[PDB]
Ligand binder design. Structure first.
Ligand SMILES: CC(C)[C@H](NC(=O)CCSc1ccc(Cl)cc1)C(=O)O
Ligand SMILES: CC(C)[C@H](NC(=O)CCSc1ccc(Cl)cc1)C(=O)O
Lengths: 162, 163
């Protein structure tokens, strides 16, 4: 169910967005903290259907970025589909405080045998988006580990295919 | 979220299932019409978490198939997540009766400019699973076209990233 959003460019003329072309669509790759993008609810994995009423279908990442950069005025309109690839998985820490996965560059790379991750069908080649509702996009691997280590027993992660 | 299913092998010793290892999970790639698999509601894109209470995590396609083939007894339990990557998109036919995409082998390959498919952000490298609630997995491309051609103006398609 798409929604329309209005962004007002900041002091530098930016909205705080990086976009990526995938499967002839345009998706939010990065939302800068406290940016116009952040303040209208944009998140990693949001799909951009329209920029200023023009279809993004088949646009390169460069084209989407050029269109945003060239946009005359204070106001940019986007049609957004909320994180359509988003999946949430709930795991429980074992006696050693582990849920049972390895990751690199925010991307899950292996599932530990007979772990909570194994029982719950956690998948590799998926980016970690949130841990217990907290956004981890753009964090270093050691900061993601810090958040997992400081979690209670219940660990809910939001993932998306890389 | 997960559900348990019990299969019995048919007269030929088959359950009517092909499994595929993707991202260190196990997914249903094929369900044969009127198979034991079909009758317990297994579908293309279902995730298999457990076979006979053992985790499928990190299993090769071969291992999953060996485990099923060697399963002692008539009775096989599987823990299933229902088509977890399944997404629905609604489009409207234009004056020519088109929503605006090309597909081959049930996989969307291009989006037509200025179409309902374009406006609604339909994606390529996605398999068509259902049209207007009707399952099209296993149909020939001409049969998928037949269903789209006989649809009313509103076309709701269920898609999934391709294997
Ligand atoms: C942290 C969570 C996922 C923990 N897993 C592990 O410790 C294995 C390695 S992940 C990792 C990768 C890079 C850094 Cl810099 C730190 C850690 C668990 O299984 O519950
Ligand atoms: C059929 C529907 C999806 C129609 N799109 C097209 O006709 C382009 C060609 S797809 C196609 C591929 C194989 C067969 Cl055997 C038949 C058709 C629309 O855009 O509404």
């Amino acid at each position: 169910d798409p929604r329309e959003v209005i962004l007002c460019k900041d002091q530098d003329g930016k909205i705080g967005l990086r976009l990526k072309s995938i499967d002839n669509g345009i998706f939010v790759q990065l939302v800068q903290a406290n940016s116009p993008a952040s303040l209208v609810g944009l998140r990693f994995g949001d799909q951009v259907l329209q920029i200023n009423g023009e279809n993004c279908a088949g646009w390169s990442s460069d084209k989407a970025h050029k269109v945003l950069k060239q946009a005359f005025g204070e106001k940019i309109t986007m049609t957004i589909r909320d994180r359509p690839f988003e999946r949430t998985i709930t795991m429980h820490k074992d006696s050693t405080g582990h849920v049972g996965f390895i990751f690199k560059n925010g991307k899950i790379t292996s599932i530990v045998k007979d772990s909570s991750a194994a029982r719950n069908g956690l998948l590799t080649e998926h980016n970690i988006c949130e841990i217990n509702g907290q956004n981890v996009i753009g964090l270093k691997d050691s900061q993601i580990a810090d958040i997992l280590s400081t979690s209670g027993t219940v660990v809910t992660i939001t993932i998306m295919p890389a």
